[PDB]
Every structure is written in structure tokens, then in C-alpha cells.
Amino acid sequence: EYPQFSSMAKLKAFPHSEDGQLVRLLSWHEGVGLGGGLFKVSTSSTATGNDGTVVVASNGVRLLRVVNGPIWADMFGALPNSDIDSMPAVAAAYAYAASVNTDLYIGVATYKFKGSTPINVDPSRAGIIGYQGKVRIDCSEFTGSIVFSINSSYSYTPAAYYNNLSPALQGLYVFGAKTSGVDGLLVGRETVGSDKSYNGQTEVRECTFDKFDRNIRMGHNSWRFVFYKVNSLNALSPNGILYVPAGLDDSGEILSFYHCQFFDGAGSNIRLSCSSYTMVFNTCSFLNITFFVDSASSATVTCNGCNFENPGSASTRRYVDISAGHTNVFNIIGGSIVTNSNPGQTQALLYVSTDNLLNLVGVTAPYGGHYQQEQELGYHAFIGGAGTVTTSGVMLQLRNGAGTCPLHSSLSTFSNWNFGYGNLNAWTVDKGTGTSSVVEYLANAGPKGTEGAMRVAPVSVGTNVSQVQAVTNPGMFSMSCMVNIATTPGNAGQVSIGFLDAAGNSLPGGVSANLGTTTGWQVIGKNTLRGKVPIGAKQVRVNIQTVAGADVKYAYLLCNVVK
Amino acid sequence: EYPQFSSMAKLKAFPHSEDGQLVRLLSWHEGVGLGGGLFKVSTSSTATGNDGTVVVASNGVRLLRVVNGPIWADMFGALPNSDIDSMPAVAAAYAYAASVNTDLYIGVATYKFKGSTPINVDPSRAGIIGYQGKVRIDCSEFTGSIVFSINSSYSYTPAAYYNNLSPALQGLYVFGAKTSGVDGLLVGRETVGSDKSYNGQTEVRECTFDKFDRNIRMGHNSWRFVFYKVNSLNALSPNGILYVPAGLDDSGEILSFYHCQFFDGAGSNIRLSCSSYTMVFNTCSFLNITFFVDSASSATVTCNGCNFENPGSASTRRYVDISAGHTNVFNIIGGSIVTNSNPGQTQALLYVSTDNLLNLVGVTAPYGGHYQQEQELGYHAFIGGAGTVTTSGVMLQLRNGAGTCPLHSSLSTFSNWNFGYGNLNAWTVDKGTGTSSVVEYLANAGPKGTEGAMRVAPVSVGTNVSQVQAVTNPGMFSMSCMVNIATTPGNAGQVSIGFLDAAGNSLPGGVSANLGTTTGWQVIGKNTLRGKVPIGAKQVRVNIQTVAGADVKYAYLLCNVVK
Amino acid sequence: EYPQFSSMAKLKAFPHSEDGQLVRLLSWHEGVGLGGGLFKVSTSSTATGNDGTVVVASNGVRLLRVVNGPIWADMFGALPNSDIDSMPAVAAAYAYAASVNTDLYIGVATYKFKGSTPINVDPSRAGIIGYQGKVRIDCSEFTGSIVFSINSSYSYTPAAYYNNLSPALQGLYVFGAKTSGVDGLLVGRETVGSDKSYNGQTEVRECTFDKFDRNIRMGHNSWRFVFYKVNSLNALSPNGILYVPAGLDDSGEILSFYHCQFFDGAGSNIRLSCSSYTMVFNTCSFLNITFFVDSASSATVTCNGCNFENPGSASTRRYVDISAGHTNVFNIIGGSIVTNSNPGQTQALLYVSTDNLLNLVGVTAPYGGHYQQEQELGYHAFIGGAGTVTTSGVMLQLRNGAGTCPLHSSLSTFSNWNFGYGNLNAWTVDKGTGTSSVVEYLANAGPKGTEGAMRVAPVSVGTNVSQVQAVTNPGMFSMSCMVNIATTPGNAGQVSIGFLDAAGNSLPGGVSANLGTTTGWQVIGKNTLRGKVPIGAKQVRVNIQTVAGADVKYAYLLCNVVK
């Protein structure tokens, strides 16, 4: 005889007695066809009854489901595409799976998670895998603080052996309704435990988090998690795409993201605020959001082959804003930075504050005619802030018809470029025969009224102000200037850049910008003061010529040679 | 009771009537044992009959297969290791799977795809997964335009939630017979749709494409696809390993390749022709093929930790040819460039055209005695073209017994290195007491007849031509020269390189190369003019000594100091 | 009639006679419920029995298991959580799986592997997949030389089509008992085979190797393997975390590691000893172990986004030791280098030997008050060895209260920094009016007694020794010096660093360190001689002032400007 039973209730009611008998369950719920399987009668098992993988019959005899491979939620009575809250059945199935160090599968379908009780995934025991397709976890009615957390139950082993063997979460679209106070995923622990939680090597892959307060938030013990093909979008919090708060314990080692997409925040963004925290992003995209870094110290973010872009957006938000702290480093290596047109880009899209560093390697700096960064900076450049920028292998868009701009003040070719010395030192001021000509430093006379400017008012003959510095091939350059013509009898002058070899031979490839006749502060140089460093150049010379009878103020004479 | 039927045809013939009854199918095809399962009789179902997951019995009653997990092709009557065309059963199973947002599994075996109808995978609905092992999809008799295309049916959501949740293709060896007009995989769409297709985050993994016309071709909407462990080899088209044509719409954001192998093209290659297109290759290998970039503008390719090599090949093909356009950037960061011997490498293996940039970071430049790049360039260097090269952390093979060469013209240490000034300026020509010694610039007199040369024909005493430039530690250097001795009474002279500190102290370790006595254009410097920059060096001085009575032409005096 | 059999023994003993009949096996072992399935009776097949998928009944009739998808070890009688050796059943199941190009699954549980015969996985035919959870393979009683090896049976095809389609090993924790002579995983072949083995694209993922002699060792044909989420810890051999021995054939192309953790060796380490070998590590961590590179030539290791740290360890072991050979390159790009306090870090944590190169890109160099590298080097710097270091985008910890140090001798700003010229050249020695002041080079008089030193003993008025060099913004600097005051009448002097523009204007912010009055060799500069390069600086000047009546030796005047 090979007994078969049509439902879990009927299986449980029968007086099973023969040890080792195999009994078939057709379905967990009568008439559905899911959750069935083979069960072994055991009269001496100590296993806990759970109406799923261990059934205690009414006479006390245990029936042990024969499972090869993962546990499935339907083994505990979960149903696909049901209007009943599925979180209890998933939580019960997960508790069993974790207890036997086996992953839990959720069959592909839609599920509703209601109530307020989170699921804590223990990556040292079991992950939760949507199997396989577009598994939809509707948390729009969930009211708890977090839907999922991921945190090991151990301080060392066997987490050091087991976390890496299977993902913690895979294959799930998890979404809310942007209710204040409900977050999606907590990576680590809410509060500091008495002992550490060993979370290294834990993976979240092929999941989307959407429409939470914070979609993904790092907690304590957030270290060596890896994310592959994770999407985070449309969160409520200003920090809601991905938030790493300050003050985390036992956190920060190589948080890694491969081919993840952080996007369409509609006001939500990424913020890294924890000190001594190292994040690596490989082939990720950051779209219509800002990446803020305000850690007190020792944040290191590396973006290898990533894109930063504003697709379909009119927002002037920054792409990367390193705004506080010291010894914070942000690397952009390869990939792309793309700036679609908007009504006017009135602030720098990259910003690096004092004592911090933004490194650009092997990436092209974009240019667009809508660039208006001078509204923030006082002058036309791509990057703001008093930190440091470095370039290695950076390409400028030298053939862009709208222009090119320098990248940053810290890359200035010329000394006293902004008259910040408080005088005209480092510049040679050649009035020629014009003994009456006026050339004066003026405090608080530049574009913002808080910086110096050089006023040039030649009489009878023009005045030439110049500076020479060492350069060599290979390289490319762009210069911008702020100029304010007060009056002029025609073209007011020109700014020129030329190159010489070490013997004083003038090389081809000199460029020049005419000042014109329009009064008021304006940017000079966009599509003129740019080019490639000639092969054999050893010196670069800038010259500012102002004609007789013109009266011009100059500020922020910013050349960058990327080399 | 518990009814069972031995075939799909027998299941359909029975007059099922009891709503909710579960019925077992032993096998789809009688006697095979595959494709069976449990079916639920459903008297009110609106489901589409398909002889797979929805069966309409002879009396009109629907039976619904109870599926937990992915759909499998054998549920629709597909059979393994059959000579019958399996593409119709796979296409029918895929249409159903996609309609329910569930992936499709193909059981591991060999399959033949015939006919001319492609399968379009919609990554926002379902992927196709060979499960699990070496699944072989023989398309040698397929005559359609493409075997697989991958393109979303949606312009935004739910593609933005679903594409990342599962791969689009996994686990398949897909091959043709190199017939003209049959491509393997189309990434995106053939023609521009009235709305965009949201393809970001779609993955192809663990697949091989072989013996098609173009194995992998990008179409419109090709953006943020990721490829892992994908092999492409032995295509028919000259661009057949991976082709990105010009003019694609809505394409180019972070196309990403992890641990992919592009190889053994037997005349097929990679070509990137689309503008504003960004590709990232991590740990890939490019073997016995060329990577062409001819985008009109704004291509950015980053190769992190990749290998470029010619294993087992006698071909002189280039490894990387950035051949057209402007503002195109190609980065080689880490990894390796390996040049096995061939009968003579008569063109540069890397080429970067005017207005483009090739960045080398942390990689060793190889050298081999079969290098003969001067046949193309006119002079002995590793990289061709009028673009720019940068180096950061590049190692030269300074102990290579065959020699070492400079990398590129744009890294020239000395000014007027190729006599491109049209004169001998930047060089100090010291005739000593030799008042009748001849030293002259000759137009169109170098190796190619298109460049300048310097002729030195001293009388009574030798002539020394020198130049000094700034250098610093750390660094490594290699110089090559082209020399043509017309006549000489013995060794014609010597080229030397030495270093000084800023105070004029000569530092030990200078190097020198004899010119010898052989007539005709020859390369000087291979094993001689190379070394490390001494710690404390601040100047480098080159000197070319030509003896009395010799008559020698010099061209292309190319030194590179890698930092 | 759907016949059913309760065990493999009963299936074999029954007098089957009807050709083509499908019969059901409930379980391989009576009463277990695992390993059952459908079998097709064949009166014509004479296939060789294997008691798993091809079963020969006692009457000679063949019963052919109908399998869809992977082979499972329980189909051959393997049992979970058994005290019997499971290696024979896994090896028999694997041999069959490989023969049909199908992967082998091992159901999640614990297994004991005993005996001494390895399993050689052929990645061109079949992988072994623990499915799905924390699969535990206890090899504590295994006595063979290796547990698993991975090496293809083919020289070209179909390995070029198949290796990438599925992993070779996945999902397994494999552990020993640290018995001498028993290794865990051999990547490739033990000895040089008759033809090459085509191993490219083979993956090991989601596995842990623990407590072997060497946990992971490369053999011949080790090329283009990829490892994802692999852990290696607690090996017996000094090279036991990961060993690449010298002398391998057909090996070294792009061995790739993604998100792997190499850790807690308790005396075991990573060692790369093979020449012409290229390894790429992305988001890996190296914890409480050393990474040794002693390849004779042409090793290239790239670490992208990795961490090197000593968490919880008092050991002074190095992090990276490139100790031999030539033309070896090690890249650290992004990521972090973290140095938790210990009783005194008495050797350099990074070391690069002559003719080799260590490149640092976009990473912060740490500092700690426990740094005592001068005990090894003779002077206070972070990196040892006579090789070369480069920096690009490197951050120094300028706000670290304990100090900052220079990175390496090869980055010396000043010439004759260590008196290695054998004289005082490159330094300006201004005795002022002090005609009797003594300033002299002394051989074998520095900290180690094997290097030069400069002794300054001024009479009546102080002596100032200075040097000037070119610098530019942006940059950061740190200088250390070794000083030995023999006698002094008060503060012995000061070392100062200042900046000028190209016109000789002194820029604000110079720094200085007093020498004090303590006798004996000491480090000067830690928290004093450091800072940012002023924007507009073009020269840096160091000055060493020694007061009248003092008698002081100076050595190792090491400034580094990271530009």
C-alpha cells in the first residue's frame, strides 16, 4: 500500500503508526495542489511539529517531510496570489529553514506582507530566494519599522564558513507606499549587541527596493556585504535611496555593489555619514539623485565604471557632494558623467570640501551650453569646494561646440589666479609707454563682492599682463576668466595662451579670446581657451591684453592643464 | 479517487467535471516520463488553452497545471536529444512563462532550433535558463535574422522593478554554421519604437555564442545590460564577435562585461561604432581578435584587469585600434598585454587616432624581438596614431633580452624629436673646431619620405648634437632612434643618455649605443637606451656624437620616460 | 497500472519484462524517501549499470532513470547527515553526470569524505553544486593529497563552449583537520599533461575552504578561473591560504577573484611564486595574513577596492611583500589599508624589492602612533625595499594627531636625501660667518652604521643646510628625518619646509620641527613636517639649521610630495 492524503489536516488526523512508512501528501490546502510531498512516519523523532516539514499526528506520531534541497514556503501553507497576509507563513517557513541551515524558496507569484513584524534573515543560516521570476512582495500595508533585516546570530564561526555559501535575499521586488517610518531593508543591526555579529560575505542580489522611507539602511555590523543587480528607487526620505548613518559600530569594511542602479529618488538620495567606511561601486548608475558624503573622517568611496546622469530631469541637484569632514576620498574611475540640458546648471555638479579629495581617472568631463556654475562659484568651473581634485587620463570635450571649462581651483596652472594673494604678485604688468595707465588690485571687487579683482585702465597704449609656467606633453587644457568691461572704444582686448619649448621657440597651437564690447560680469574662454598641449612644449604663457581707453576688471583667471 | 493519466492526449480526452479535483499526468508524451505533473480541474477558468499549463478537455473543462517555480519546456512537449525542431515548443512555453512573469527552464540536453522565427525575450517578464549543465542549442539549420533578441515590452515600470530580478538568458551554448544573414543575439531592438524600451539591469550570463554572422549585436535601447561569463567566438562578420553599430537610439549607458572571453574570431572582431557609448570590461580576455573603436565621438571603454593576447596566432592584427572620431577614451587598467612571437610584428598593436586618448594604468608594456613596428610608423615604438597616450604606474620590461621600446610619440621627452618643426631648433649642434662640418635639416628625407631628417657629416673632428630636459624620480625610460649611415670610416658614433641633479652633478648610470657601420635605415636603442631614472635626478641629457668622416641621417629621436 | 517499488534493491530484484514500461522508485534506500523517480524499462539497452541512473535488474533488463535537470547524489544512494563515507556515492554520481554533460547536485546537509582518492571535476562536463544552503563537507578523516581538483579533459573544444555554462563548484563548506600533506582544492593539474587542458572560464563560487595544508593551490593549466564569494582561512602551510607555486605550465591568464575573503591564517598566507602570472582581486579582503609575491618575473597583481587589515591581531607581519624577481607589478586601487594598534610596528607593512613596482591609486595611506618602521629601514617611512612606488590620488592622514610619514625612498623630493652620493653634493651648506664650523660627510655613520650621514658642528654662529626643488599644486607632503644630537647647549636646531611661487614670493604656511636636546638617533617630523601644497606654489625649500655649539648627525632626509 502507498497511502495518500488530500490535505495537511487529513494527513494529521490519521492514526499513522508504522515507522519508515512513506506517505504522500497531495496538497497542503485541500484542492490547491501546492505544498504536497512525501512524509516518513517516525515514532521516535524529537522534531518540533510545525504543520509544514514536521507534522505531529493526532495520536502523537511524527511525520517528517522528505526534503531534498531548499524549504519552500508553500510547504507551510503559503499560497500564491492570495489576499491573505503571507508574512506569517513565510516567517514560519523561514524559522524552520534557518534552524536546519537550509535556504527558503518563495514560489514566483505576488504576496502581501501586512502587520508590523519584521523578518530577520540570519545569513549564517538561511536566505530567502524568490524562485524564479518576477516575485512581487507588496508591503504597502505593512506598518512596522523595517520589513527585512539581515544580521548573523554568531560572532565568528560558523558565520565565517557559511555566510558566503548562499545569498541572504535574491529575486524579490519589495515595495511599500512611502509611509513615513517604514523602511525596506536594514543591513546589520538596529542597536549595538553585547557581542559582534559576523556579517561578512553576505549577499543581496537581484532585488528591487521601492517606495519605502529609507529603502536600504546600514546598521551596526554592516561589513563586507555584497549587492549584485540591486535596484533602489523612489524613497520618501531625503536619504532614502541608500543611507549609512553616523556612529555605526563594527562597520565599514568593503561594502560592495556590482551593477546596481540607484535612481529616480523624486527627492531621495544616497548619504554616507559614517566615518572609517569604505564602499566600492562597480558598473553602477546614479540617476536623478545626489551622492552625499558628510562623514567626519576616513570615508573612501570608489566608483569604477559607473554613470552619473540626470535623464529626463530638469533638476540642478549635484551628482556628488562631499560636504564635510576630513580625509574623505571619492574616486571616479572610468565610466561616464553625463549632463543632459536643463534650464541652467547654476551650481557645480561635483563638490569636494576642505581637507577631502575627489580623484578622476580615465573619464571624460562633460560640457554643455546650459552650464552656469559661476552663479554658485563666482567663476566658470565644473567642480566646487575647497578640497583637492586630481586627474589622471581625463579627457576634456575639446570639440564640443558649446565650449569646455576648467575642472577645479586646485588644478590652477597659474599662481595668484584669483588675486587671493591680496596683490598682483606673480603677474608681470607691462604698461609699455603708458605711464598714465592704471593697473590696480581691488579688494572685494570680483563677481561676488568678496574676492579680489585686477582693474586695468590703459591710457594711450595698451597694457599686457602675463605669466609663464612649466608644462609638458601629453596634456589638454581649458581656461575660463571672469571679465567686467566698464567701457571700451571697440574690442576691449584679448586673453591668449601660447606654448614655448625650453629654448624659447614659440610652438603652433596658440589660442585667444576677444573680450568684445558687452559690459558687466561675463565668462570668457568657453569655446576659445582650450586645446591640446603641443608635443615638445615646455612652457605655457598666458597674456591678458587690454586696449588703450578700455577699462576692464579681471577675476578668477583659472586655467587647468589635465596631464 | 487520485486519478492519473499516461499522456497529455489521454488527459484531454477524459470528461473531467469536478471543480478542484487534482489529477496527475504521468508524462506529456506517452511513455517518456517528462512533462508530467498535477493538474487542477477548473470549471470557471478563463485561461488560454495551450496543451502545456492550461489543458482544455474534450468537454470544454479547463485543467490548470499546478506549477510552483519556473515553467519548463517539457511541460509543453519539448523533448531532450531529439532531431525534431524544438524551437516551437520552447517559443510556446516562453510565451506562457512571460505572460505570468515566470522564468522558463530548458532541461539540460541537446536541442535543434530550425525555421526562421526568432525568440524575443522580454526581460521585464521572463528569462530562458538552461538547467543545469552544458545545454546545447544547435541553430545550424536556423535561417532567421536573429536567434534571440532581448528587449522589454515597457517604457518604464514594471521594467524598472523586474528586469534585475532574474537573468534574461543563462546556461546555453548557442551556435550556428556561419551562414550569412543569421545573427546570434540582438541586445535591444532592430528599429526605433514609438516609445523607448526600458532594458536596464538585464543580464545574459553563462552563455556561449559561436559561429553566427554577428554573434552579439547591439540594437536600439541597448543600455545597462550586464554579461557574466559570456563567450563569443568564431563569427563570420569582420565585426562579428561583438558589434555596436552607429546611430543607435536610447543606448550606451554602462554596457558591462564581467569575466567574458572574446576570442578566436578567425577574421571576426569587436567594433564599437556608436557615439556616446560607455562599455566596461572587468577580467575579460580578448584573444586573436582586434577591438576597434570608430565612434564619431564620446566612446568610453574601460578594461579593468583584462588580457590582450595572440595565443597560437601568427597574425599581425592590432589588439586595440581607436581609429576615428574625437573624444574617444580607452582605458587599460591592470591586467596584461602579451605578445607571443610571430614572423614579424610590422604594425603597432595599439593605435589611437587624432583627438582620442588611450590610458595605460598599472600594466606592463611587453617587448619581443619580432617587433617591427617601424614598417608602419617609420620608427620603433609600441603605439601608433596621432592621439594621446597617458601612463600611470606602467612598467617597462627593462631586463628583456630582446630590448625595450618607447610607447608613443605623445610621450616624447625631447622637443622637435621628429624634426617636425621643419628645422633643427631645440637641439644644440656643437661642431667643435669643425668649421666645414655639415649639419642640415632635410625635408621629406626620413624613413618614409614624408618627414624631416637631420644629416650630420663632420669634417676633421666629430659633431655632438644634444638636448637637456627636466625629469624626476621615480621613472623608467626607453629611447629609440632611426639612423641611416651613408658612409663611415669605422663606428659612426654613439647616442648617449645621462642624468644630472638640479645642481649639475652628473649621476652614475648613463647609457650609450654605438651606431656601428651598417648602411641603410636601422633602429638604434633597443637593448642600450633604457633604464631606471636615478633617485635625485632632475635633468636628462641626450647626446648624438657623429665621428669625423661619417655621413649619417637621423630621424625620430623618441625617448619616453614613464613618470 | 503504474508500478511502484520501495527501494533500489526491490527494483533490481523484480522480474521486469514489459519493454518501455514506466515504473516509479519511491526511494533508493528503503524507508528514506530520497533518490526516487521514474525509470523506463528497456529490453534492448545493454548499457552498463551504475545503480543510479542506469540500473541492471537481476534478470538483465535495463531500467533507465528519467531525469530532467541536474543529477542528484541521492540518486546513487548518497544519504544526508550519515556517518558513512559519502565520497564514493558522490564520485559515482559525478562520473555519470560528467558523462552526460549535466551538473551534479548534493542536497543540503552534512557529509563525510573519507579515504584518499580525490574527485577531479571536469569543468567542461559537469560541476558539483551544494543545493541549497549551508552544505558541509567534512574531510577531517580524508588522507589523500587533494580533496578536489578541477581540470578539463579537453585541449580546445567543447571546453571553449562549455566551461562557462555552469560553475565547477558552488555552495560548499569544505574543511579538514590541518593534517600535513592534505590540500583542499587544486586549481588545474598536478603534473604537466600530454596536451594542454582548456580551463578558461571555469568558476568556483560560494565555497569555503578551511583547515587544510594548502586550502587552495594552483596547478598547471591554471588560467581564467574566476572565484566569487570564496572564503579561505586557517590553513597549516605558511603558504596555505592561496598558493601559486613556481614553474607552472600554461598558466597565469587573468585569475580572477570577486568579493573573496582570505583571512585568519594563524600562520598561513598567500604566496604568488609563478612567473608571467596575472591575478585580479575585486572587493576582496586580506585579513591577518601576508600577500607574498616572489615570482622570478612578470607577476601582475591588481587589487581593486580591497581591504588589507590586522583586525584583532598583535602581529607585525607585512600586508604585501614583493620580495624577489624583476618586472613584478602590484596595484592597490581604491579600497583601504587599515593598521590597528599593536605593541610596535617594527617593519614596513608594504615592501617592494629591486626592479619591481608597487602602485597606489586612490587610497589613503594610514598612520598610527605605534609605527616603528625605522627599526627595519633605518628611517621612518611606510614602505620598504629598493623597488619603485608610484602614487596617483593618494591621501595622507594630515589631521592624524599621531603624525604622518613619507611613503617611500623612490618618491624622495630632494636629491642626495640619504647621502648616498658619498658626499654632501646637492645641498647648499651655508656656514655664514662661521669659518671654523665643521660640516662633513661621514661614511657608515648613520642609524644602521652602514649608510652615510652629515655631521654639523658649528662654531660661534649657526649653519644652515638647504635644498630647493620644483613642486606644483595640487599635492600633500610629509617628511621624516633621522637625527642624532651628540651634544648641544640648548635646542639644537630646526628643520623647516617652505614654499615659493616661480617669482620668489614666499607663500604662507611654512612648517618646522625643533630638534630639542635629547641625544641618540631619533625620528624628526612626524606631526610637524606635513601639510598641503599651497595653490600657486612652484618651489619647495627645506632648511636644516644647527645652532652654534651643537654637534649633530643627520641621515635619511626623506620628503615625499604626493601629487
Residue numbers in the entry:
A (entry chain C), B (entry chain B), C (entry chain A): 15 to 577
Task: Give the text the authors published on this PDB structure.
The recombinant K2-2 was crystallized in a monoclinic P21 unit cell with the asymmetric unit containing two trimers of the enzyme, which were virtually identical. The crystal structure of K2-2 was solved at 1.38 Å resolution. The structure of K2-2 exhibits a compact trimeric architecture with a length of ~112 Å and a diameter of ~75 Å in its widest region. The particle-binding domain (residues 15–85) folds into a barrel-like structure consisting of a four-stranded β-sheet and a two-turn α-helix. The receptor-binding domain (residues 86–420) of each monomer folds into a right-handed β-helix composed of 9 complete rungs, with an N-terminal four-turn α-helix (residues 101–114) capping the lumen of the β-helix. In the trimer, three β-helices are packed laterally through β-sheets, forming a parallel left-handed superhelix with a hydrophilic channel at the center. The interior of the channel features a triangular interaction network consisting of three inter-chain hydrogen bonds and three intra-chain salt bridges made by three pairs of Glu217 and Arg219, each from a different subunit. The C-terminal domain (residues 421–577) of each monomer is organized into a β-sandwich topology, consisting of two antiparallel six-stranded β-sheets, plus an N-terminal one-turn α-helix. Therefore, we decided to use inactive mutants of the enzyme for subsequent soaking and co-crystallization experiments. By analyzing the surface properties of the receptor-binding domain of the enzyme, we discovered a prominent negatively charged cavity located at the intersubunit interface, formed by the conserved carboxylate triad Asp278-Glu323-Glu267* (*from adjacent subunit).
Here, we describe a phage tailspike protein, named K2-2, that specifically depolymerizes the K2 capsular polysaccharide (CPS) of K. pneumoniae into tetrasaccharide repeating units. During the initial stage of infection, the tailspike proteins (TSPs) of bacteriophage recognize specific polysaccharides on the surface of the host cell and attach to them for adsorption. TSPs, also known as polysaccharide depolymerases, have the function of binding and digesting CPS. TSPs typically consist of three domains: an N-terminal particle-binding domain that connects to the tail structure or baseplate of the phage, a receptor-binding domain that extends from the homotrimeric structure and is responsible for host recognition and catalytic activity, and a C-terminal domain that plays a vital role in trimer formation, receptor binding, and intra-molecular chaperone functions.
